[PDB]
Amino acid sequence: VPGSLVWELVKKNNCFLIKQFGNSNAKVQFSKEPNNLYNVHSYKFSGLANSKTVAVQPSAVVLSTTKTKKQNTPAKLQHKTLMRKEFRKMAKSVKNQVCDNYYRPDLTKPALARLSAVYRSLQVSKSGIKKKNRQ
Amino acid sequence: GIDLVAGGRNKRTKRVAPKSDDVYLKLLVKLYRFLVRRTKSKFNAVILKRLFMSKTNRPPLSMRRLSNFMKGKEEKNIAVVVGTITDDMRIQEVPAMKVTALRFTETARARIINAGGECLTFDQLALRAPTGENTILLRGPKNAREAVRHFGKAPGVPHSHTKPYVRSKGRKFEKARGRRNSRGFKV
Amino acid sequence: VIWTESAFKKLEEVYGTFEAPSLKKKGFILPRPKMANADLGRIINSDEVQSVVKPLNKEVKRREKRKNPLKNVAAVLKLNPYFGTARKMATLAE
Amino acid sequence: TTRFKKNRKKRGHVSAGHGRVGKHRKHPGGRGNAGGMHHHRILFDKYHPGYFGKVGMRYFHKLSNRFYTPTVNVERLWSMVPSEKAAEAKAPVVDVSQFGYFKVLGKGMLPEKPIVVKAKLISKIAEKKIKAAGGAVVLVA
Amino acid sequence: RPLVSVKALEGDMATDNSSSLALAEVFRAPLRPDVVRFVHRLLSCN
Amino acid sequence: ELPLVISDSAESIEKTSQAIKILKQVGAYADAEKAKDSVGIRPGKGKMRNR
Amino acid sequence: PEKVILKRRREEVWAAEKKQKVAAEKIKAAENTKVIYAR
Amino acid sequence: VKHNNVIPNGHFKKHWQNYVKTWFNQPARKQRRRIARQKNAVKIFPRPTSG
RNA sequence: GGCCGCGCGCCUAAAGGCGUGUCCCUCGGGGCACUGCGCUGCAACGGCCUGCGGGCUCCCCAUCCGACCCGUCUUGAAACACGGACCAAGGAGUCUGACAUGCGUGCGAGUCGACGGGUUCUGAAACCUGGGAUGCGCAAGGAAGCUGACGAGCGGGAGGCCCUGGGCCGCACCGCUGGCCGACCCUGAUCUUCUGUGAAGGGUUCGAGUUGGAGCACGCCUGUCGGGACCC
RNA sequence: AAUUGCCGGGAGGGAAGCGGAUGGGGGCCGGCGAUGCGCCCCGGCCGUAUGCGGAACGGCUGGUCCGCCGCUCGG
Ligand SMILES: [K+]
Ligand SMILES: [K+]
Ligand SMILES: [K+]
Ligand SMILES: [K+]
Ligand SMILES: [K+]
Ligand SMILES: [K+]
Ligand SMILES: [K+]
Ligand SMILES: [K+]
Ligand SMILES: [K+]
Ligand SMILES: [Mg+2]
Ligand SMILES: [Mg+2]
Ligand SMILES: [Mg+2]
Ligand SMILES: [Mg+2]
Ligand SMILES: [Mg+2]
Ligand SMILES: [Mg+2]
Ligand SMILES: [Mg+2]
Ligand SMILES: [Mg+2]
Ligand SMILES: [Mg+2]
Ligand SMILES: [Mg+2]
Ligand SMILES: [Mg+2]
Ligand SMILES: [Mg+2]
Ligand SMILES: [Mg+2]
Ligand SMILES: [Mg+2]
Ligand SMILES: [Mg+2]
Ligand SMILES: [Mg+2]
Ligand SMILES: [Mg+2]
Ligand SMILES: [Mg+2]
């Protein structure tokens, strides 16, 4: 079952999709799944309708990519790496496992953006926010 | 103020998508939307339009029609119908034909394959004939329906052979006073 | 769904296959998909499809900004390049 | 299903789609097929010619099973012959009564192969078509 | 037909060492949520 | 594996504790735990009915 | 990757044929600039 | 009557609503008939159940 | 009144701007020109930022302009035409049957498992099974007796193909002319159980016909009709 | 809720209410509105190569991570 077929089955309703404000122009949608970098309900970003996916979540930052020949076996579907180095070294590994490999090069900018937000979130976790970012 | 009808807007309606919700048909529509955008083929443009059509606008085609429309031109020619291929017991010889259709009956699929032919889907015809080269586009009989027999002029006007809507058939069901000269008139 | 082995092995006796007498359910065949290969990417990006397609086109046009063809000199130049020359012969007053 | 009915789209609109002048009344025009010769005559004449009057003779206690004669055309006879019997064929002999048929009619083309047909009844063209293919007919009861 | 492994609960008994059954043809059927939604509505009425 | 075929030994278990043990072995117990949680009163009038 | 290589070959091939179209267009545009001047 | 329809013939001019027969007891009739067949079978143990 | 996407890889000049060579034009000084790759969200300044400051879709009031009470029948309502003192809760196109067009789903010359039977450890679910003839279809016409489709062309046509506008093949649909079946009328070689048959040959006649198998089941909206039948 | 009392506020020359537009008065609000970002003395971590452990991508080469070493110096 290819990703295009899976997308049409899960597009309308989903255990991870959150919809709000009805079906007018007011509608706001998001996705809750991991391996969904921007948490957006779209084919490009969906963690359910794509064979190759990247997950950038904290724990230390865990990067996870899925194996294409292990779709039928969920227990071995995720190849996970845990990195505790400096940001640039982590940013280099994300570019290596996502861009240079040709494993979803279209996600290299969303993945680096999410790694920035996750690393920044961890930065303030150890030392509380001493300045607010309104400028 | 400018003198126009309905403001100049188009009042005719047409289908720009299939009314059905079949995901495999939605995937066919996406594929053929791409083909008519970037190949500019007249054949692909017709396929996309018929993929939107309703059930009564895509009549079934039988084997008898197919084996006669594809008579000598069954080598290097794929028959294309946007609809269903049904079987026909009234014929005995079935040549080897390449046929693509939305659906085959299990008797028609068996008849084609046993004769040496192939049954293709429209996603397979796109690989073989991306621009529809060396193909025969076919349609079933649009007006071979019992409903169409009641269409047209009213049954009670001269020169009309429209079917009436009668609950039963017999001598006591609409055969007197309007159907023969011995009772009034005969329209 | 968690299948015990006996249930899974029976799954072919029940529901059979595309062959006519191949199951318990009388007068039933497995349904056939309308699309033999639902991989849209592998059909759009096939050799046969990509060898009949025209060059890609991503030049977004827009309504050209107005440029006053009566007073804006650069505008009245691109339209009627004989403008300017007509003025000079006009200013050639004896 | 109530959610898709057009009355739900007419809530707030006074007349419910029936007009302010020619309202919705009980039975303007009568009940059922009333006035089919007086004020519904044009409708009855236009869409149901033949409706009034009496033609033909009566049949008291007309039993349907007396007139039971299922029919089959020649163009369908060879579908009753199995594949291995056609390969062996001499001509296959088909008793159409074992398939639920009484009379054999002659619409369509027979293949140019002999066939023997057993039936209670048959038309003249069906017999001519069967003989032209090299076959024969046996009348049974 | 690809083979489906059979998970063993007796991880120390292991009467055999290989067991894999061909994938049932019913698992390659088309997926039709439009007809599942239709047939589920009418069966729940019963 | 999602087709998740299990050996015919599970056909012989007869205890609920045995069933819980089988689910844990096949990795299918977090699904049963979620169902065990989330059990609650139905809001609305169906409460007052027999649901 | 042969999938990558095919795409790279054709984006250059089209781009070269795009250069020819504009290079041919400069000559046309210049010539018509003075044809309409004369008229 | 207003369009090209069949001539209507509805046999609903009497008090037909006092003579409506529903079938909500159909699955109960099936069980009652099944139960009597098993009782009759035990009443004649070796005799064939088909009469 | 609304808008904010030329300039530098030569030099000098706050900066606007100037500064090269070539051919032609005369009457003093210009004109048309060299065209090679790249990057490419206009500015300057001020007051104010926890205050008696700014804003406001909220409340009240003032002023100017505009503004007749809604619903309803009606050609025409603000009407000296009816209903309405106010508020809360309740209050009117529904259910069923038969058809029909459209649409959606399955199967397809078939389709329907609807009444029954088997089974069913959650079950008035579900699942299986009975049709070689149950219902609609697959064949008409005729009051009936009774007969029952011997297999088409033409014009226009989407699309496909070949040659470099032309040619070939042409689906659906429209139009025209036929053939065949049946009612009525005509016709008659020959065989035959003597009253049947049918080689040929037809018709300003009639059919809800054929020369296209498309239907069956279910679901929904709409429309007509029987029912209290939109409500009183 | 209709409707009523009291307290406080506002308006009123034979109705009032209503639409648009401002103003006066009131009641609100601080995501109502900023205080960070690049260069430098103080705090504090490691390439290159290695042994080892797991698990990847493409269709046999090459990849990342972690913990440990032993050279290294830029962060
Ligand atoms: K209406
Ligand atoms: K009952
Ligand atoms: K009135
Ligand atoms: K009044
Ligand atoms: K109608
Ligand atoms: K039947
Ligand atoms: K007659
Ligand atoms: K009604
Ligand atoms: K007061
Ligand atoms: Mg206007
Ligand atoms: Mg208008
Ligand atoms: Mg007349
Ligand atoms: Mg009214
Ligand atoms: Mg009326
Ligand atoms: Mg009137
Ligand atoms: Mg509640
Ligand atoms: Mg009565
Ligand atoms: Mg009046
Ligand atoms: Mg009024
Ligand atoms: Mg008055
Ligand atoms: Mg009155
Ligand atoms: Mg009053
Ligand atoms: Mg109410
Ligand atoms: Mg005749
Ligand atoms: Mg006769
Ligand atoms: Mg009433
Ligand atoms: Mg109050």
PDB file of C-alpha atoms (C1' of nucleotides) in Angstrom, chain I residues 109-229:
ATOM      1  C1'   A I 109     -27.141 -11.677 -18.963  1.00  0.00           C
ATOM      2  C1'   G I 110     -27.895 -12.084 -15.194  1.00  0.00           C
ATOM      3  C1'   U I 111     -29.443 -10.031 -10.278  1.00  0.00           C
ATOM      4  C1'   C I 112     -32.143 -10.414  -5.701  1.00  0.00           C
ATOM      5  C1'   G I 113     -31.319 -15.006  -0.051  1.00  0.00           C
ATOM      6  C1'   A I 114     -36.710 -10.776   1.276  1.00  0.00           C
ATOM      7  C1'   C I 115     -39.642 -17.106   4.116  1.00  0.00           C
ATOM      8  C1'   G I 116     -37.401 -20.765   5.791  1.00  0.00           C
ATOM      9  C1'   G I 117     -33.283 -23.923   7.568  1.00  0.00           C
ATOM     10  C1'   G I 118     -28.202 -24.209   9.945  1.00  0.00           C
ATOM     11  C1'   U I 119     -25.427 -21.913  13.286  1.00  0.00           C
ATOM     12  C1'   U I 120     -24.268 -18.299  16.647  1.00  0.00           C
ATOM     13  C1'   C I 121     -20.872 -18.196  24.840  1.00  0.00           C
ATOM     14  C1'   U I 122     -22.027 -10.547  24.349  1.00  0.00           C
ATOM     15  C1'   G I 123     -25.859 -10.496  20.871  1.00  0.00           C
ATOM     16  C1'   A I 124     -33.742  -9.762  18.315  1.00  0.00           C
ATOM     17  C1'   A I 125     -25.948  -8.521  15.586  1.00  0.00           C
ATOM     18  C1'   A I 126     -23.244 -11.279  12.646  1.00  0.00           C
ATOM     19  C1'   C I 127     -21.961 -15.652   9.524  1.00  0.00           C
ATOM     20  C1'   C I 128     -23.462 -19.917   6.106  1.00  0.00           C
ATOM     21  C1'   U I 129     -27.234 -22.204   3.099  1.00  0.00           C
ATOM     22  C1'   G I 130     -31.981 -23.220   0.076  1.00  0.00           C
ATOM     23  C1'   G I 131     -33.942 -20.751  -6.926  1.00  0.00           C
ATOM     24  C1'   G I 132     -32.179 -26.298 -12.757  1.00  0.00           C
ATOM     25  C1'   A I 133     -36.125 -21.764 -12.963  1.00  0.00           C
ATOM     26  C1'   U I 134     -39.262 -17.163  -6.564  1.00  0.00           C
ATOM     27  C1'   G I 135     -39.630 -11.987  -8.469  1.00  0.00           C
ATOM     28  C1'   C I 136     -37.882  -8.566 -11.993  1.00  0.00           C
ATOM     29  C1'   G I 137     -34.742  -8.780 -16.582  1.00  0.00           C
ATOM     30  C1'   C I 138     -32.945 -11.740 -21.180  1.00  0.00           C
ATOM     31  C1'   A I 139     -39.021 -11.045 -27.038  1.00  0.00           C
ATOM     32  C1'   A I 140     -42.673  -9.124 -29.606  1.00  0.00           C
ATOM     33  C1'   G I 141     -47.385  -8.535 -31.839  1.00  0.00           C
ATOM     34  C1'   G I 142     -52.490  -9.963 -31.554  1.00  0.00           C
ATOM     35  C1'   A I 143     -59.334  -9.433 -28.765  1.00  0.00           C
ATOM     36  C1'   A I 144     -58.152 -14.354 -29.539  1.00  0.00           C
ATOM     37  C1'   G I 145     -57.014 -18.804 -31.831  1.00  0.00           C
ATOM     38  C1'   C I 146     -51.805 -18.408 -32.652  1.00  0.00           C
ATOM     39  C1'   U I 147     -47.404 -16.892 -34.667  1.00  0.00           C
ATOM     40  C1'   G I 148     -42.516 -15.000 -33.251  1.00  0.00           C
ATOM     41  C1'   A I 149     -37.097 -11.078 -35.120  1.00  0.00           C
ATOM     42  C1'   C I 150     -33.117 -15.673 -41.656  1.00  0.00           C
ATOM     43  C1'   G I 151     -28.328 -11.115 -39.066  1.00  0.00           C
ATOM     44  C1'   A I 152     -27.970  -3.340 -42.865  1.00  0.00           C
ATOM     45  C1'   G I 153     -26.310   0.790 -45.298  1.00  0.00           C
ATOM     46  C1'   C I 154     -25.588   6.335 -45.980  1.00  0.00           C
ATOM     47  C1'   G I 155     -24.332  11.842 -44.288  1.00  0.00           C
ATOM     48  C1'   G I 156     -22.056  14.411 -40.206  1.00  0.00           C
ATOM     49  C1'   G I 157     -18.862  12.899 -36.377  1.00  0.00           C
ATOM     50  C1'   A I 158     -14.510  12.558 -30.829  1.00  0.00           C
ATOM     51  C1'   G I 159     -10.205   9.938 -31.140  1.00  0.00           C
ATOM     52  C1'   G I 160      -6.342   7.021 -33.411  1.00  0.00           C
ATOM     53  C1'   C I 161      -3.078   6.169 -37.646  1.00  0.00           C
ATOM     54  C1'   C I 162      -0.032   7.446 -42.556  1.00  0.00           C
ATOM     55  C1'   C I 163       2.201  11.267 -45.870  1.00  0.00           C
ATOM     56  C1'   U I 164       3.491  16.490 -46.159  1.00  0.00           C
ATOM     57  C1'   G I 165      -3.030  20.436 -46.066  1.00  0.00           C
ATOM     58  C1'   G I 166      -4.296  15.452 -47.880  1.00  0.00           C
ATOM     59  C1'   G I 167      -5.818  10.148 -47.039  1.00  0.00           C
ATOM     60  C1'   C I 168      -7.481   5.737 -43.980  1.00  0.00           C
ATOM     61  C1'   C I 169     -10.380   3.662 -39.800  1.00  0.00           C
ATOM     62  C1'   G I 170     -14.138   5.619 -37.473  1.00  0.00           C
ATOM     63  C1'   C I 171     -17.044   4.981 -30.942  1.00  0.00           C
ATOM     64  C1'   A I 172     -21.359   7.796 -28.706  1.00  0.00           C
ATOM     65  C1'   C I 173     -25.035  10.956 -30.540  1.00  0.00           C
ATOM     66  C1'   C I 174     -28.183  13.320 -34.458  1.00  0.00           C
ATOM     67  C1'   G I 175     -30.409  12.711 -39.214  1.00  0.00           C
ATOM     68  C1'   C I 176     -31.930   9.682 -43.661  1.00  0.00           C
ATOM     69  C1'   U I 177     -33.134   4.976 -46.139  1.00  0.00           C
ATOM     70  C1'   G I 178     -33.733  -0.063 -45.612  1.00  0.00           C
ATOM     71  C1'   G I 179     -34.097  -5.480 -43.963  1.00  0.00           C
ATOM     72  C1'   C I 180     -36.542  -8.986 -40.382  1.00  0.00           C
ATOM     73  C1'   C I 181     -40.935 -10.326 -36.331  1.00  0.00           C
ATOM     74  C1'   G I 182     -46.196  -9.755 -35.265  1.00  0.00           C
ATOM     75  C1'   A I 183     -51.769  -7.359 -36.269  1.00  0.00           C
ATOM     76  C1'   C I 184     -54.371  -6.296 -41.001  1.00  0.00           C
ATOM     77  C1'   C I 185     -53.987  -6.891 -46.316  1.00  0.00           C
ATOM     78  C1'   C I 186     -51.774  -9.166 -50.505  1.00  0.00           C
ATOM     79  C1'   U I 187     -48.984 -13.452 -52.468  1.00  0.00           C
ATOM     80  C1'   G I 188     -48.031 -18.941 -53.998  1.00  0.00           C
ATOM     81  C1'   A I 189     -43.163 -22.728 -57.122  1.00  0.00           C
ATOM     82  C1'   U I 190     -43.548 -26.907 -54.325  1.00  0.00           C
ATOM     83  C1'   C I 191     -44.388 -30.647 -50.704  1.00  0.00           C
ATOM     84  C1'   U I 192     -48.482 -32.526 -47.699  1.00  0.00           C
ATOM     85  C1'   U I 193     -51.839 -36.512 -43.256  1.00  0.00           C
ATOM     86  C1'   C I 194     -56.738 -31.915 -48.359  1.00  0.00           C
ATOM     87  C1'   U I 195     -55.671 -28.490 -45.289  1.00  0.00           C
ATOM     88  C1'   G I 196     -51.787 -27.449 -43.852  1.00  0.00           C
ATOM     89  C1'   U I 197     -46.768 -25.806 -45.917  1.00  0.00           C
ATOM     90  C1'   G I 198     -43.893 -21.903 -48.295  1.00  0.00           C
ATOM     91  C1'   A I 199     -39.398 -20.890 -53.508  1.00  0.00           C
ATOM     92  C1'   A I 200     -40.333 -16.210 -54.815  1.00  0.00           C
ATOM     93  C1'   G I 201     -42.838 -11.370 -54.496  1.00  0.00           C
ATOM     94  C1'   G I 202     -44.813  -7.536 -51.606  1.00  0.00           C
ATOM     95  C1'   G I 203     -47.599  -2.839 -48.401  1.00  0.00           C
ATOM     96  C1'   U I 204     -48.711   5.949 -48.609  1.00  0.00           C
ATOM     97  C1'   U I 205     -51.274   0.611 -42.979  1.00  0.00           C
ATOM     98  C1'   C I 206     -50.576  -0.568 -37.521  1.00  0.00           C
ATOM     99  C1'   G I 207     -46.858  -2.120 -32.735  1.00  0.00           C
ATOM    100  C1'   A I 208     -45.118   0.183 -25.866  1.00  0.00           C
ATOM    101  C1'   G I 209     -40.829  -4.562 -31.769  1.00  0.00           C
ATOM    102  C1'   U I 210     -35.950  -6.328 -33.663  1.00  0.00           C
ATOM    103  C1'   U I 211     -31.270  -5.399 -36.711  1.00  0.00           C
ATOM    104  C1'   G I 212     -27.169  -1.802 -29.578  1.00  0.00           C
ATOM    105  C1'   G I 213     -28.279  -7.940 -24.746  1.00  0.00           C
ATOM    106  C1'   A I 214     -28.530  -3.794 -19.634  1.00  0.00           C
ATOM    107  C1'   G I 215     -30.588  -5.197 -16.177  1.00  0.00           C
ATOM    108  C1'   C I 216     -31.226  -6.618 -10.903  1.00  0.00           C
ATOM    109  C1'   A I 217     -30.622  -5.270  -5.775  1.00  0.00           C
ATOM    110  C1'   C I 218     -29.712  -1.473  -2.143  1.00  0.00           C
ATOM    111  C1'   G I 219     -29.209   3.852  -0.468  1.00  0.00           C
ATOM    112  C1'   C I 220     -30.541   9.151  -0.691  1.00  0.00           C
ATOM    113  C1'   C I 221     -32.924  13.910  -2.479  1.00  0.00           C
ATOM    114  C1'   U I 222     -36.878  15.637  -5.302  1.00  0.00           C
ATOM    115  C1'   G I 223     -41.985  15.015  -7.705  1.00  0.00           C
ATOM    116  C1'   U I 224     -47.144  12.648  -8.280  1.00  0.00           C
ATOM    117  C1'   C I 225     -50.794   9.650  -5.635  1.00  0.00           C
ATOM    118  C1'   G I 226     -53.414   6.745  -1.186  1.00  0.00           C
ATOM    119  C1'   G I 227     -53.344   7.356   3.843  1.00  0.00           C
ATOM    120  C1'   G I 228     -54.797  12.376   9.889  1.00  0.00           C
ATOM    121  C1'   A I 229     -50.695  13.551   5.318  1.00  0.00           C
TER     122        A I 229
END
